């Protein structure tokens, strides 16, 4: 028989092989740094220095032929192309008409971005977070935010993956008009023009691949030489160990929508259809993909944009020109996406797009029922309430009534409730709707008692400014705080108020707050008892689930109350 193929593990890249070529010690164009080949270039050196080479070589992936090809004297490449990326035994073995003899076995790596080359991620949650059999019809939903694994150093093997069945992943963005993310300050501007390098507008990219892709964690078994590391390879790791989970990219948020208000141009739309339907092509455990434009008609980031007559419509393109796209990966991998959205509960963010035509293309709806109210002025009110205010004026909750000067309000009050029955009543089906919960409070300072119309109600008096702390407090900005900050800074374990401030709860409105009447700090957030009620109503009115903003600024409060309030309900998911 021929001399036994002895593998050259050095020659042959030690047996590691990628689909994807990412770039690692370099910041870059996002066509640049990403390449994706839909079969994996698989070459690995043998030799065969004493006796007979043969004349053919067999490749075998536990047990099963994958390759052959010609042998060439004593030292011979095979090289071949494989599609299923996975962890295989291999074998190369030499043939002539006297025999065959096999090379001694060796695991080969095939990395693809789905995790089939990945075990199960160790997980390492915080134990306060519980166990429940919530129905798996209901959406558990929550964001991970790419930037919380600095500051805030909440990393993928944190989130409490068995009490989630959607984690959005925030956030794409999209090359061109981008001035609003100079808000954030820093380099986050900078970072998506080195990005954008290159790229087309209106195609997405990543905004920070040392964070998606980049970044050694040795929690996740990461080497600085191994192919895809980050947070993506610890969701590919993620859905390895829980593959019911759908993970789905966010496109846009609060800060990236910019670019949205120019799809009033079908051509931008088709740039950018094609360019997620390469992205979920390339990243493979991304399950669909979820569109957070804030907002069609205007009124987020951009004081300059938005279109009330053409963005609706727009917006209604985008949800079918994306499902047709979907609809063509569905049949290209055999595989179900999902198609959703985020959008604002405010009626005049609702009246600027016809949801009972977008939503015949959508899996759900992300319905943001918070930041009704908050620091950007010095006006009290509660920021995630269902219901209307004991705050509010006669008429504020209907819109009917006047304001204090005497003029009309232009709408109902910003609550969730008012958001979800304008939805329902223009045919958008319940169980497409999921109501938000905040893990963050938002707050003011200079709230003092002198200041309340009624004095047992801190949200009739008046601020002077947005509430200060800092970062271990659980304040990245001034006047939003971490919900685990309000935990440890102003409830306490019993929920009875430390550092001078005392809880109160509207149950009106079922909307919590702390008020520290010395210092006039004052937070309006969610808390166990407001996201029992959120359950209980979205049990009630047959919704799909409950999200939440965002699982960094949990303690597992929140996810807890999220399905304590969803015991016993089922509910029929879109179809
Ligand atoms: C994109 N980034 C990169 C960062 C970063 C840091 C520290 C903070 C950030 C950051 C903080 C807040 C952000 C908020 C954002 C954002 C991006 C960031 C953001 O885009 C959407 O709104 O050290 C390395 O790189
Ligand atoms: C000014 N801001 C910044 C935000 C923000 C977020 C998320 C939401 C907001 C936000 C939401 C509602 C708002 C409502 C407002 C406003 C500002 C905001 C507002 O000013 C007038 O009424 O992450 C980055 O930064």
């Not at 390469?278 to 979820?290: A, C, H, M, P, R």
Request: net charge negative; glycine share 12%.
């Amino acid at each position: 028989a021929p001399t036994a193929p002895s593998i050259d593990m050095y020659g042959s890249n030690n047996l590691q092989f990628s689909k994807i070529e990412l770039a690692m010690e370099t910041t870059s164009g996002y066509n640049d740094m990403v390449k994706y080949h839909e079969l994996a270039k698989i070459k690995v050196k043998f030799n065969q220095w004493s006796g007979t080479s043969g004349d053919t070589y067999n490749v075998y992936f536990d047990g099963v032929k994958v390759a052959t090809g010609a042998i060439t004297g004593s030292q011979t490449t095979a090289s071949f192309e494989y599609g299923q990326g996975g962890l295989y035994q291999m074998e190369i073995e030499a043939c002539d008409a006297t025999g065959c003899s096999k090379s001694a076995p060796v695991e080969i790596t095939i990395a693809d971005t789905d995790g089939s080359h990945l075990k199960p991620l160790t997980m390492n949650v915080d134990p306060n977070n519980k166990s429940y059999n919530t129905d798996p019809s209901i959406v558990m939903g929550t964001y991970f935010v790419e930037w919380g694994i600095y500051g805030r150093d909440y990393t993928v093997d944190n989130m409490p993956v068995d009490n989630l069945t959607h984690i959005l992943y925030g956030f794409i963005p999209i090359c061109g008009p981008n001035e609003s993310v100079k808000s954030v300050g820093g380099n986050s501007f900078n970072a998506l023009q080195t990005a954008c390098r290159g790229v087309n507008d209106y195609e997405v990219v990543i905004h920070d691949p040392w964070a998606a892709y980049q970044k050694s964690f040795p929690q996740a078994g990461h080497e600085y030489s191994t192919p895809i590391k980050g947070n993506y390879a610890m969701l590919m790791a993620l859905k390895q160990r829980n593959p019911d989970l759908k993970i789905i990219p966010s496109i846009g948020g609060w800060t990236l929508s910019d670019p949205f208000y120019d799809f009033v141009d079908k051509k931008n739309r088709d740039t950018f259809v094609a360019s997620v339907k390469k992205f979920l092509k390339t990243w493979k455990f991304y399950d669909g993909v979820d569109i957070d434009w804030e907002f069609p008609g205007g009124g987020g980031a951009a004081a300059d944009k938005g279109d009330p007559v053409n963005d609706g419509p727009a917006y209604i393109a985008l949800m079918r020109e994306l499902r047709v796209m979907l609809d063509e990966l569905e049949a290209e991998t055999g595989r179900t996406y999902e198609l959703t959205s985020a959008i604002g509960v405010g009626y005049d963010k609702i009246e600027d797009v016809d949801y009972a035509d977008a939503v015949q293309y959508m899996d759900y709806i992300f319905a943001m029922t918070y930041d009704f109210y908050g620091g950007w002025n010095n006006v009290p009110g509660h920021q995630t309430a269902l219901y209307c205010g004991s705050f509010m004026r006669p008429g504020q909750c209907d819109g009917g009534g006047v304001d204090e000067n005497g003029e009309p309000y232009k709408g109902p009050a910003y609550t969730a409730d008012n958001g979800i029955q304008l939805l329902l009543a223009q045919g958008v089906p319940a169980n497409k709707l999921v109501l938000g919960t905040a893990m963050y409070g938002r707050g003011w300072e200079g709230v003092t008692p002198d200041t309340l119309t009624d004095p047992n109600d801190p949200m009739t008096g008046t601020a002077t400014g947005k509430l200060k702390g800092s970062t271990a407090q659980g304040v990245w900005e001034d006047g939003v705080i971490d919900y685990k900050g309000i935990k440890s800074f102003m409830l306490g374990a019993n929920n009875t108020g430390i550092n001078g401030f005392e809880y109160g709860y509207d149950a009106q409105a079922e909307a919590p707050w702390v008020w520290n009447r010395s210092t006039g700090e004052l937070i309006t957030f969610d808390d166990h008892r407001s996201v029992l009620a959120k359950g209980n109503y979205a049990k009630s009115l047959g919704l799909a689930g409950l999200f939440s903003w965002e699982i960094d600024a949990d303690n597992g409060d929140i996810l807890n109350a999220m399905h304590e309030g969803m015991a016993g309900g089922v509910v029929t998911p879109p179809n």
